[PDB]
């Protein structure tokens, strides 16, 4: 299954497929083929098995040696050991977030259900690069600090440039946790020092305490239909949710409720929403059958919902509770909030436009990323430490946790501040 969710976030032009296939062995993929124009801009999924020969390096199935195929310029070979079967240490899960700035709201959502991260830095561009800081800050807000910085694209980048970049990032982030996070330079054109990464992810990132006894909550981020185009009438199936569970052991045959709900017909107001109920058909993770779905892992829960809800990606950031979950489904919400004194996620060589942003004005639409949900809503009352927001589609608030608040600076939204629900 899975034990931890390590995320693979990283700004434009570092190469995703080479690094993702080295760590998991499962390709990051989704629509267009044209696998991506540059680096993956979709929310990729992948799981993997991490075993040892009693060595800090992680074998392949063929554990005698491993000859890469990253480049035919030279032969990159590494040796994990010699063969006689290897001991399974754990089953790991990844969360490949978008690597592009416009997709920030999606990157936030996907990130918010991980248990650790890997900041994929690229040495090609600017030294205190916008997105590195954006990522790091969001991570410390959500409730994580289990980060391993990875210098992913320094294959042709000289050692002065690459040294200056790690220095400037680590010096800018002087108020964000990063001093207890290692910085592992690797090759992505010769897959070198990959074996030492395997030692790091088992060290810096154990399994955090998971609450089995507590009531099941599944947060769905990806939508999958298994009926698909060309289905037969008596080959009928349910609709499958790619979600991570962050609380409770969800068992097979259990009934689960999707709690933001669907709005009642001919509503004259903003209420009323009614949750949808679906019975769990199957609990699939990796490529191995399971009867349980332990928390701390990203699992494909097939449920008895019908094709229309899974025919496109429409279940992004929905909260699912088993069953008749107590969590309130607000339509208008009381945010406590604070703002950054800089504009996060933007800053170029001329140092534009990380200038301090003006105060929020009422009746402006802002993206409130609450939980893994992403709703848009307008601010109806605006006091400094008390704003009232009215949301277009209702938000199930599992706990008052955190929020991330963004404002439409130009073409798309950009992160301005965070806070906590009251």
């Amino acid at each position: 299954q899975a034990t931890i969710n390590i995320g693979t976030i990283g700004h434009v032009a570092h190469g995703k497929s080479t690094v993702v296939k080295a760590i998991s062995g499962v390709h990051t993929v989704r629509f267009k083929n044209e696998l991506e124009r540059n680096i993956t801009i979709k929310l990729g999924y992948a799981n993997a098995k991490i075993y040892k020969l009693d060595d800090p390096s992680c074998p392949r199935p063929e554990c005698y040696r491993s000859c890469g195929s990253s480049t035919p310029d030279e032969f990159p070979t590494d040796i994990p050991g010699t063969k006689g079967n290897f001991k399974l240490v754990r089953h790991v899960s990844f969360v490949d977030c978008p690597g592009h700035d416009i997709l920030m709201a999606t990157m936030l959502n996907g990130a918010a259900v991980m248990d650790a991260a890997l900041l994929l830095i690229a040495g090609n561009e600017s030294c205190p690069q916008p997105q590195t800081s954006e990522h790091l800050a969001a991570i410390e807000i959500m409730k994580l600090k289990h980060i391993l910085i990875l210098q992913n694209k320094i294959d042709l980048v000289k050692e002065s440039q690459a040294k200056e970049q790690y220095e400037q990032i680590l010096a800018f982030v002087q108020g964000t946790v990063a001093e207890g996070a290692p910085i592992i330079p690797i090759s992505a054109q010769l897959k070198y020092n990959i074996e030492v990464v395997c030692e790091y992810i088992v060290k810096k990132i154990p399994v955090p305490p998971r609450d089995f006894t507590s009531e099941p909550r599944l947060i769905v981020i990806r939508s999958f239909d298994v009926n698909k185009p060309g289905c037969e009438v008596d080959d009928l199936k349910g609709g499958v949710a790619g979600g991570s569970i962050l609380k409770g052991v969800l068992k097979v045959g259990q009934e689960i409720e999707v709690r933001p709900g669907i709005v009642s017909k001919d509503s004259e107001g903003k209420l009323m929403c009614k949750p949808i109920f679906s019975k769990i058909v199957s609990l699939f993770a990796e490529h191995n059958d399971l009867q349980y779905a332990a928390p701390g892992g990203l699992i494909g829960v097939g449920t008895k919902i019908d094709p229309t809800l899974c025919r496109a990606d429409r279940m992004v950031g929905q909260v699912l509770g088993a069953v008749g979950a107590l969590p309130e489904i607000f339509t208008e919400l009381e945010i406590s909030y604070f703002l950054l004194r800089r504009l996060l996620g933007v800053r170029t060589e001329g140092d534009k436009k990380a200038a301090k942003v003006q105060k929020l004005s009422k009746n402006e639409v802002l993206m409130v990323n609450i939980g893994s949900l992403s709703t848009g809503g307008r601010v109806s009352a605006v006091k400094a430490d008390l704003g009232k927001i009215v949301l277009t589609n209702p938000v199930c608030t599992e706990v008052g946790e955190k929020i991330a608040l963004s404002r439409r600076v130009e073409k798309h939204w950009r992160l301005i501040g965070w806070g906590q629900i009251r």
Partner: peptide, 17 residues
């Protein structure tokens, strides 16, 4: 912090031309 980096830098960059 930077020990992790420099150890692996002298591992990596010795194998470059």
């Amino acid at each position: 912090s930077e020990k992790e980096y420099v150890e692996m830098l002298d591992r990596l960059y010795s194998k470059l031309p």
